[PDB]
Amino acid sequence: SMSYSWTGALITPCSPEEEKLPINPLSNSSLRYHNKVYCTTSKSASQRAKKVTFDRTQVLDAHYDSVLKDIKLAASKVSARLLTLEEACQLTPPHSARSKYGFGAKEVRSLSGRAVNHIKSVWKDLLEDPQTPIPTTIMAKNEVFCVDGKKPARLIVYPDLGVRVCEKMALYDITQKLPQAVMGASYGFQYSPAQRVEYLLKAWAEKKDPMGFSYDTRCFDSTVTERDIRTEESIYQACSLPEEARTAIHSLTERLYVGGPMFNSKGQTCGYRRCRASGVLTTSMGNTITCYVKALAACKAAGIVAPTMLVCGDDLVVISESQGTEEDERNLRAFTEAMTRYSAPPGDPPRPEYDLELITSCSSNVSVALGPRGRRRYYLTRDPTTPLARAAWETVRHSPINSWLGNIIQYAPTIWVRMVLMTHFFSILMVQDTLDQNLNFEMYGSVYSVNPLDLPAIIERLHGLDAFSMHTYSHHELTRVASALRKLGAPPLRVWKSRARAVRASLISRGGKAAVCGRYLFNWAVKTKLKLTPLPEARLLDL
Ligand SMILES: CCNc1cc2oc(-c3ccc(F)cc3)c(C(=O)NC)c2cc1-c1ccc(OC)c(C(=O)NC2(c3ncc(F)cn3)CC2)c1
C-alpha cells in the first residue's frame, strides 16, 4: 500500500516562518552565511511529502520469523502496568501542544476537572471502540541546516493532547521496560556518551579481525508497513499486562498507529497515512525494535559473522568479524537486499570500515585526542558546521528554545564545543545576566530544562573528567572546526582562544558555581593549567 495519500490541501504553518536570515550587504561574513545556511519551512512540505510517498512491498522469510519469535519470547518475561490517569497527566511536559477541546498542558498537569474528565472519555472510548480512525495534525518542522541541495522540511504527525495522555496510560511503562528487555546491550538509548564509546571500544576489541558498518534506511517512518505496526502490537501483547492495557493497546494500534487521516493547522484534510506516525509515544521504541528485528534477520540472511549491534531508532551500527574486503562487500550487499525485502531500503549504501573512527552514525564518529601526558582518549564528535550555524541563527533571532545547548552536553569533549560554543554561550549568559536561570533546549524531539552553572557536573557525569583535558586533537578535528568557522564567516580559533581567557576570568570573578565553570570548562585556554579534580557534585543523579 501507499505510505500516504494526499488531498491537495497544503501543510500549513501556525507560526511566522523564515527560510533565511536577512543579509547585511556590507558584511562578507553575512554573505558566506546567507549562501550556506537555511531554515526548513512549510513551503518545502510538499517536496518532503513527494519523497515519503511510495508503495511498500514486504517479503518476509524464516530468518525474519526466527528473530521475531526470539524477541516475543524475551518480551513474554516482562510485566508492565497501567499508569493511573493522574500519573499520565503528571508526565505531560509544561508546554505540550494544547488540545482542540479547549485545555492545555497547564490544565492537564494541575489535574483540572474538565481536562481530567475529557481524558477519561478518550480512555473509555479506546476501551469500547477498537476501529474508528483517530485524527492527527501534520506540521512542517522548522530546522536550520548548512548546504552540501536543500533538505525539505521534516513532517510531524501527532494526535490530540487527550489521546497523548491515554497513550502514556497504556504504554508508558512498556516504553521504559520493553526495549532493554528484548534488545539488551543493543538498545542504544541507555548509554551516556562515555558509556556508548566504551561499548564500541569493547565491541571492536573483542573481534579477532573487526569490521564495522552503519546502515541508513531511506525515509524509515514511511517504510514501516501496517503489518510491521501490528507486529509491534503483538510484541507489546507478549508482555504480562492488565486486560484494560491490552484493550487500549489494541485500539491505539488499529485507530492511530497503523494509520489515519491527517489535518493541517487550519483543520483541512491533508491526507491519509498508512505508515509510522512521527509524533506518537511509540515512534522511538517501535522504530528501534523494528529496525533491530529487520537488521538481525538481514545479518543472518547475509552470513555476517558474530554481529554486535547498536540501534538508535532507525540508526544502526553492526561491528562483526571481517571475512576480508571482498566477502565483506558481498555480505553488505546481501544485508542490503534482505533489508530492502523487509521494507527498510537504503538511503546511502553501507560500506565496510576497518577503523572504528571511520564509521558515521547519528551524524557522529569516534575520534581520538591525547591527554597532557600523551594518553589516547576516545570520544564522539561530528562535523561542527550545522551546530555552529544553529548557534549563529539565534544571535539575530532570539528564540525561547536554544537549539545548541544540547551540543554542549552531548559533545562536551570536542574542540568545537570547548573553544567556540562554550566561549560564546557563557559570554552571552553574562551579557544578558541570565547565568543562574534555568533554560529550555531541544534534544531529540523533546524540550529539556537545565541550569548552565551545573554544566561541569553534568559533563563529568556523562563524559568523565577527561572532557576537560583533551589536550591534542587530531588533524581532522582541527581542520573540521577551522573550515566550519571559515564557511560560516565566523572568527578563527585564535580569536575564540583570546575571548575564552576573558570569559574564564569573568566567570572566576563571580565565584561559586560560575568560578567552577570558568576553572573546569576553560582550562584549555590557559598555559598555566590548574589540576582539575573530580567534582563531588558529579556524584549526583541527572538520569
Ligand atoms: C553524542 C552525540 N549523540 C549520539 C552519538 C552517536 O554516535 C553513534 C555511533 C557513531 C559511530 C559508531 F561507530 C557507532 C555509533 C550512535 C549510535 O548509537 N548509533 C547506532 C550515537 C547516538 C547518539 C545519541 C542519540 C540519542 C541520545 O539521547 C536520546 C544520546 C545521548 O547521549 N543522550 C544523553 C543521555 N542519554 C542516555 C543516558 F543514559 C544519559 N545521557 C546525553 C543526554 C546520544
XYZ file of C-alpha atoms and ligand atoms in Angstrom:
587
model
C 0.000 0.000 0.000
C 0.908 3.689 -0.401
C 2.780 5.127 2.659
C 0.488 8.215 2.313
C -2.451 9.537 0.190
C -2.874 13.355 -0.285
C -5.965 15.577 -0.956
C -4.033 18.548 -2.386
C -4.589 20.761 0.721
C -1.315 22.447 1.900
C 0.650 21.599 5.060
C 0.213 25.000 6.703
C 2.320 26.859 9.321
C 0.970 28.074 12.700
C 3.909 30.464 13.335
C 5.727 33.088 11.138
C 8.477 31.303 9.162
C 11.883 32.323 7.813
C 13.908 30.420 5.180
C 16.924 32.777 5.535
C 18.236 35.432 7.923
C 18.286 38.957 6.316
C 21.641 39.725 4.687
C 23.823 42.621 5.853
C 25.080 43.962 2.452
C 28.275 45.461 3.942
C 29.447 42.192 5.567
C 31.296 39.412 3.656
C 30.605 37.069 6.675
C 26.823 37.737 6.310
C 27.162 36.771 2.596
C 29.022 33.443 3.268
C 26.373 32.590 5.946
C 23.481 33.562 3.558
C 24.942 31.361 0.774
C 25.119 28.302 3.067
C 22.557 28.412 5.829
C 18.806 27.936 5.556
C 15.855 27.064 7.775
C 13.295 24.423 6.590
C 9.725 25.810 6.418
C 6.140 24.771 5.379
C 6.995 25.942 1.761
C 9.068 22.715 1.205
C 6.422 20.451 2.943
C 5.152 19.224 -0.472
C 8.707 18.248 -1.602
C 9.026 16.132 1.592
C 5.511 14.702 1.010
C 6.636 13.531 -2.505
C 9.831 11.865 -1.197
C 7.988 9.984 1.601
C 5.068 8.812 -0.653
C 5.641 5.396 -2.255
C 4.237 1.889 -2.382
C 5.760 -0.630 0.025
C 6.414 -4.297 -0.712
C 7.346 -6.735 2.008
C 8.751 -10.275 1.606
C 9.475 -11.984 4.986
C 11.489 -15.244 5.414
C 12.491 -17.908 8.017
C 15.387 -15.591 9.154
C 12.829 -12.840 9.970
C 10.394 -15.334 11.701
C 13.184 -16.785 13.862
C 14.344 -13.315 15.110
C 10.692 -12.192 15.719
C 9.991 -15.371 17.767
C 13.070 -14.699 19.956
C 12.129 -11.111 20.706
C 8.456 -12.196 21.606
C 9.944 -14.824 23.989
C 12.097 -12.120 25.695
C 9.027 -9.741 25.783
C 6.992 -12.558 27.497
C 9.325 -12.179 30.602
C 8.286 -8.505 31.050
C 5.418 -7.438 33.295
C 4.077 -3.914 32.699
C 1.400 -1.794 34.407
C -1.169 0.848 33.534
C -0.325 4.376 34.583
C -3.222 5.922 36.512
C -4.987 8.896 34.812
C -3.170 11.225 37.335
C 0.379 9.838 36.731
C -0.066 10.176 32.919
C -1.329 13.797 33.370
C 1.746 14.499 35.551
C 4.090 13.120 32.798
C 2.821 15.741 30.298
C 5.594 18.380 29.629
C 4.844 22.067 30.601
C 4.244 23.352 27.048
C 2.874 20.254 25.220
C 0.637 21.333 22.263
C -2.812 22.268 23.638
C -5.968 20.223 22.904
C -8.623 21.224 20.292
C -11.121 20.751 23.195
C -10.072 23.999 24.925
C -7.433 22.967 27.517
C -3.652 22.974 27.547
C -0.779 21.223 29.327
C -1.235 23.518 32.417
C -4.819 22.219 32.990
C -3.634 18.583 32.349
C -0.604 18.887 34.746
C -2.701 20.534 37.532
C -5.476 17.881 37.118
C -8.244 20.447 36.277
C -11.704 18.727 36.328
C -12.595 19.406 32.660
C -9.169 18.185 31.308
C -9.291 15.039 33.558
C -12.878 14.176 32.548
C -12.177 14.800 28.826
C -9.187 12.350 29.011
C -11.441 9.873 30.957
C -13.884 9.810 27.997
C -10.954 9.400 25.470
C -9.794 6.392 27.622
C -13.334 4.828 27.890
C -13.746 5.366 24.111
C -10.492 3.418 23.470
C -11.905 0.546 25.613
C -15.279 0.416 23.752
C -14.217 1.297 20.191
C -11.297 -0.635 18.571
C -11.872 0.664 14.992
C -12.691 4.378 14.392
C -9.559 6.150 12.995
C -8.153 8.793 15.390
C -7.468 12.217 13.739
C -3.934 13.686 13.618
C -2.306 17.030 12.781
C 0.504 17.262 10.195
C 3.065 20.129 10.635
C 6.348 21.065 8.852
C 9.321 21.305 11.262
C 11.473 24.489 11.265
C 15.142 23.324 11.344
C 18.377 25.096 10.445
C 20.861 23.311 8.158
C 24.028 24.083 6.094
C 24.061 23.188 2.294
C 26.425 20.424 0.931
C 20.748 20.771 -2.430
C 18.488 21.984 0.418
C 16.727 19.342 2.608
C 12.904 19.871 2.519
C 11.116 20.221 5.919
C 10.606 17.083 8.082
C 6.925 16.359 8.894
C 5.432 15.802 12.345
C 2.222 13.714 12.630
C 0.581 13.731 16.070
C -2.795 13.098 17.791
C -4.634 15.446 20.176
C -3.340 16.109 23.742
C -6.184 13.953 25.255
C -5.042 10.960 23.104
C -1.345 11.647 24.061
C -2.220 11.327 27.777
C -4.060 7.995 27.057
C -1.016 6.550 25.133
C 1.053 7.125 28.338
C -1.611 5.327 30.470
C -1.457 2.256 28.140
C 2.203 2.218 27.071
C 4.452 4.446 29.201
C 5.584 1.527 31.428
C 6.229 -0.604 28.247
C 8.468 2.146 26.680
C 10.564 2.205 29.898
C 10.948 -1.609 30.080
C 10.466 -3.476 26.762
C 13.421 -2.153 24.616
C 16.170 -3.082 27.174
C 14.432 -6.420 27.943
C 14.284 -7.561 24.274
C 17.481 -5.974 22.896
C 19.766 -5.914 25.957
C 23.093 -4.118 25.269
C 21.998 -3.401 21.640
C 19.444 -0.826 22.942
C 21.111 2.495 22.005
C 19.227 4.932 24.287
C 20.531 3.568 27.630
C 24.063 4.981 27.240
C 25.672 8.250 28.205
C 28.255 9.350 25.530
C 31.238 7.895 27.575
C 29.333 4.561 28.024
C 28.492 4.428 24.264
C 32.224 4.890 23.428
C 33.144 2.209 25.983
C 30.577 -0.145 24.321
C 32.023 0.494 20.793
C 35.653 0.041 22.023
C 34.760 -3.337 23.681
C 32.803 -4.465 20.540
C 35.844 -3.563 18.372
C 38.490 -5.174 20.720
C 36.581 -8.476 21.127
C 36.749 -9.279 17.376
C 39.882 -11.110 16.083
C 39.618 -9.048 12.855
C 36.995 -6.240 13.221
C 34.826 -4.743 10.514
C 32.078 -2.230 11.146
C 29.338 -0.576 9.120
C 26.410 1.784 9.602
C 23.072 1.464 7.798
C 20.637 4.268 6.945
C 17.100 3.425 5.890
C 15.743 5.851 3.238
C 12.635 7.570 4.938
C 12.286 4.867 7.678
C 8.881 6.098 9.047
C 7.367 5.701 5.525
C 8.953 2.212 5.148
C 7.078 0.925 8.262
C 4.113 -1.162 6.994
C 0.699 -1.816 8.646
C 1.916 -5.432 9.147
C 5.116 -4.014 10.887
C 2.920 -1.937 13.265
C 0.550 -4.901 14.043
C 3.733 -6.989 14.665
C 4.893 -4.300 17.189
C 1.480 -4.642 18.890
C 1.991 -8.486 19.144
C 5.419 -7.753 20.723
C 3.681 -5.425 23.235
C 0.908 -8.067 23.879
C 3.632 -10.767 24.537
C 4.240 -8.837 27.869
C 2.189 -9.612 31.016
C -0.336 -6.780 31.172
C -3.660 -5.835 32.847
C -6.613 -6.673 30.477
C -7.523 -2.931 30.272
C -3.988 -2.163 28.896
C -4.409 -4.984 26.279
C -7.740 -3.450 25.043
C -6.334 0.147 24.922
C -3.101 -1.017 23.184
C -5.162 -2.921 20.533
C -7.430 0.149 19.925
C -4.422 2.549 19.747
C -2.729 0.221 17.206
C -5.850 -0.031 14.963
C -7.094 3.551 15.295
C -3.859 5.514 15.470
C -0.605 3.572 14.940
C -1.467 1.660 11.680
C -2.827 4.833 10.068
C -5.458 7.547 9.976
C -6.376 10.935 8.488
C -4.041 13.931 8.733
C -5.333 17.523 9.013
C -3.318 20.768 8.611
C -3.185 23.595 11.251
C -6.429 25.066 9.713
C -8.473 21.826 10.198
C -8.435 20.972 6.468
C -7.951 17.312 5.472
C -4.384 16.867 4.170
C -4.274 13.149 3.538
C -4.259 9.663 4.954
C -1.259 7.829 6.464
C -0.581 4.059 6.284
C 2.896 4.096 7.951
C 4.610 5.215 11.176
C 3.301 8.435 12.763
C 6.336 10.545 13.748
C 4.698 12.182 16.816
C 3.323 9.202 18.778
C 4.581 7.727 22.088
C 5.689 4.505 20.339
C 7.718 6.181 17.497
C 11.173 5.775 19.117
C 10.555 2.317 20.680
C 8.681 0.943 17.622
C 11.406 2.163 15.226
C 14.257 0.771 17.457
C 12.638 -2.685 17.875
C 11.550 -2.950 14.208
C 14.975 -1.798 12.903
C 16.659 -4.337 15.285
C 14.359 -7.222 14.146
C 14.875 -6.451 10.442
C 18.666 -5.914 10.872
C 19.276 -9.093 12.995
C 17.331 -11.130 10.371
C 19.284 -9.419 7.497
C 22.611 -10.237 9.343
C 21.550 -13.945 9.376
C 20.435 -13.818 5.689
C 23.805 -12.201 4.665
C 26.068 -14.530 6.688
C 27.507 -11.680 8.884
C 29.922 -13.383 11.383
C 29.458 -12.640 15.148
C 27.456 -9.326 14.810
C 27.493 -6.881 17.773
C 24.685 -4.392 17.038
C 23.902 -0.856 18.319
C 20.408 0.540 17.414
C 19.035 4.151 17.888
C 15.658 4.284 16.174
C 16.475 3.752 12.524
C 20.214 4.419 13.070
C 22.117 1.154 13.201
C 25.766 0.043 13.574
C 26.994 -3.536 13.180
C 30.516 -4.489 14.355
C 31.485 -8.004 13.262
C 34.269 -10.477 12.224
C 35.759 -9.422 8.864
C 35.795 -12.124 6.151
C 38.205 -9.990 4.056
C 37.195 -6.914 2.000
C 35.716 -8.851 -0.999
C 33.466 -11.137 1.140
C 32.538 -8.151 3.472
C 31.459 -6.173 0.426
C 29.415 -9.182 -0.855
C 27.854 -9.652 2.641
C 26.898 -5.938 2.956
C 25.162 -6.202 -0.460
C 23.228 -9.322 0.740
C 22.401 -7.453 4.036
C 21.025 -4.510 1.945
C 18.968 -6.832 -0.331
C 17.387 -8.561 2.740
C 16.766 -5.157 4.442
C 15.026 -3.908 1.181
C 12.887 -7.145 1.049
C 11.784 -6.460 4.661
C 10.807 -2.882 3.558
C 13.821 -0.991 5.061
C 15.580 0.177 1.805
C 18.920 2.034 1.994
C 19.483 5.756 1.652
C 23.251 5.650 1.135
C 24.528 2.033 0.652
C 26.554 0.648 3.605
C 30.382 0.453 3.319
C 32.665 -1.762 5.416
C 35.145 0.129 7.618
C 38.308 -1.293 9.187
C 38.910 1.599 11.592
C 36.263 2.331 14.258
C 36.815 6.159 13.668
C 35.619 5.882 10.028
C 32.000 4.823 10.820
C 29.371 7.632 10.808
C 26.108 7.012 12.704
C 23.624 9.539 14.227
C 25.784 12.090 12.279
C 28.701 11.189 14.627
C 32.069 9.403 14.624
C 34.577 8.293 17.249
C 37.724 10.458 17.428
C 40.978 10.269 19.366
C 42.580 13.103 21.336
C 45.721 12.945 23.505
C 45.743 13.987 27.180
C 48.509 16.220 28.711
C 50.714 13.089 29.352
C 50.063 11.590 25.871
C 47.290 9.093 26.728
C 44.773 8.347 23.890
C 41.164 9.263 24.832
C 38.231 8.187 22.641
C 35.090 10.353 22.295
C 32.158 11.100 19.950
C 32.283 14.081 17.610
C 30.591 15.286 14.378
C 31.072 17.912 11.653
C 30.506 21.200 13.573
C 29.097 23.327 10.643
C 25.317 22.710 11.240
C 25.601 23.076 15.123
C 27.638 26.280 14.654
C 25.143 27.580 12.042
C 22.238 26.815 14.516
C 24.136 28.663 17.311
C 24.567 31.704 14.976
C 20.826 31.678 13.883
C 19.830 32.657 17.456
C 22.260 35.686 17.562
C 19.958 37.583 15.155
C 16.822 35.515 16.186
C 16.306 35.449 19.990
C 14.367 32.130 20.280
C 12.770 30.986 23.627
C 14.182 27.451 22.923
C 18.016 27.186 22.461
C 18.866 24.687 19.632
C 22.629 24.190 20.505
C 22.941 23.777 24.340
C 22.237 20.065 23.615
C 25.526 20.118 21.624
C 27.498 21.390 24.649
C 26.123 18.476 26.676
C 26.453 15.705 24.028
C 29.758 16.858 22.528
C 31.445 18.493 25.591
C 34.964 16.930 24.893
C 35.079 18.279 21.286
C 37.341 21.108 20.106
C 34.346 22.928 18.573
C 32.206 22.777 21.721
C 35.040 23.785 24.107
C 36.636 26.574 22.059
C 33.575 28.080 20.350
C 30.184 27.046 21.780
C 31.182 27.249 25.495
C 33.009 30.553 24.953
C 30.052 32.115 23.074
C 27.320 30.644 25.422
C 28.941 31.748 28.742
C 29.685 35.188 27.198
C 26.012 35.730 26.168
C 24.737 34.492 29.582
C 26.885 37.076 31.419
C 25.862 39.948 28.999
C 22.113 39.042 29.442
C 22.589 38.433 33.224
C 20.790 35.007 32.801
C 23.714 32.833 34.142
C 21.837 31.296 37.152
C 18.495 30.923 35.274
C 17.150 27.547 34.072
C 16.897 27.438 30.242
C 14.849 25.423 27.740
C 16.606 23.435 24.983
C 15.582 20.941 22.277
C 17.132 17.408 22.324
C 15.764 14.595 20.008
C 12.184 15.953 19.767
C 11.987 16.973 23.455
C 12.244 20.316 25.303
C 14.525 19.854 28.356
C 15.396 22.344 31.128
C 18.941 22.757 32.594
C 20.892 25.278 34.723
C 24.128 26.419 32.970
C 26.009 26.543 36.325
C 25.540 22.757 36.650
C 27.327 22.072 33.274
C 30.731 20.985 34.786
C 28.926 18.375 36.999
C 26.663 17.153 34.083
C 29.696 16.885 31.730
C 31.836 14.895 34.207
C 28.908 12.510 34.878
C 28.316 11.919 31.094
C 31.891 12.083 29.728
C 34.241 11.781 32.706
C 36.944 14.262 33.926
C 38.734 13.575 30.553
C 36.288 16.029 28.830
C 38.233 18.926 30.478
C 41.702 17.819 29.339
C 41.529 16.744 25.628
C 44.931 18.383 25.005
C 45.968 17.281 21.490
C 43.171 16.969 18.909
C 43.500 15.021 15.640
C 44.387 16.855 12.390
C 40.842 16.032 11.080
C 39.096 17.644 14.141
C 41.362 20.738 13.813
C 40.576 21.073 10.015
C 36.844 20.426 10.564
C 36.377 23.355 13.064
C 38.662 25.728 11.030
C 36.726 25.029 7.760
C 33.302 25.280 9.571
C 34.328 28.703 11.024
C 35.614 29.947 7.565
C 32.434 28.650 5.712
C 30.060 30.429 8.165
C 32.070 33.693 8.113
C 32.925 33.244 11.796
C 36.137 34.422 13.553
C 39.031 31.857 13.548
C 40.175 29.765 16.610
C 42.863 32.275 17.738
C 40.033 34.836 18.347
C 37.966 32.225 20.321
C 41.069 31.394 22.440
C 41.505 35.151 23.353
C 37.767 35.513 24.097
C 37.828 32.324 26.256
C 40.596 33.814 28.506
C 38.287 36.833 29.214
C 35.186 34.575 29.652
C 37.199 32.308 32.051
C 38.319 35.387 34.117
C 34.755 36.882 34.163
C 33.305 33.555 35.427
C 36.014 33.152 38.123
C 35.279 36.726 39.382
C 31.629 35.781 40.114
C 32.773 32.970 42.497
C 30.722 29.892 43.482
C 29.428 27.720 40.588
C 30.325 30.414 37.987
C 34.012 30.133 39.115
C 33.850 26.251 38.843
C 32.550 26.735 35.184
C 35.463 29.106 34.486
C 38.080 26.761 36.023
C 36.837 23.415 34.556
C 35.423 24.440 31.162
C 38.181 26.848 30.140
C 41.405 25.215 31.430
C 42.311 24.615 27.740
C 42.564 28.453 27.269
C 45.473 28.921 29.748
C 49.136 27.686 29.595
C 49.400 27.509 33.432
C 46.921 24.622 33.928
C 45.010 24.059 37.131
C 44.906 20.476 38.429
C 41.272 19.500 37.808
C 39.973 17.038 40.411
C 36.685 15.019 40.473
C 33.627 17.092 41.341
C 31.758 15.737 44.447
C 28.690 17.232 42.662
C 29.257 14.810 39.676
C 28.338 12.000 42.173
C 24.585 13.213 41.907
C 21.751 11.947 39.567
C 20.943 13.574 36.196
C 19.010 10.484 34.957
C 26.985 12.233 21.312
C 26.011 12.522 20.211
N 24.906 11.576 20.218
C 24.981 10.272 19.715
C 26.118 9.851 19.005
C 26.116 8.587 18.454
O 27.153 8.002 17.755
C 26.738 6.723 17.436
C 27.759 5.913 16.759
C 28.714 6.509 15.930
C 29.694 5.747 15.316
C 29.688 4.388 15.525
F 30.715 3.651 15.032
C 28.740 3.754 16.289
C 27.797 4.529 16.941
C 25.473 6.489 17.900
C 24.657 5.234 17.840
O 24.310 4.657 18.872
N 24.344 4.789 16.626
C 23.810 3.456 16.406
C 25.051 7.709 18.578
C 23.922 8.116 19.292
C 23.883 9.392 19.872
C 22.759 9.713 20.800
C 21.428 9.642 20.399
C 20.402 9.964 21.274
C 20.698 10.358 22.584
O 19.751 10.649 23.529
C 18.441 10.097 23.357
C 22.028 10.451 23.012
C 22.515 10.809 24.390
O 23.667 10.555 24.736
N 21.658 11.419 25.233
C 22.045 11.764 26.610
C 21.929 10.551 27.552
N 21.248 9.503 27.074
C 21.203 8.425 27.872
C 21.813 8.407 29.108
F 21.663 7.348 29.943
C 22.497 9.546 29.507
N 22.551 10.642 28.734
C 23.114 12.814 26.852
C 21.681 13.141 27.134
C 23.037 10.128 22.102
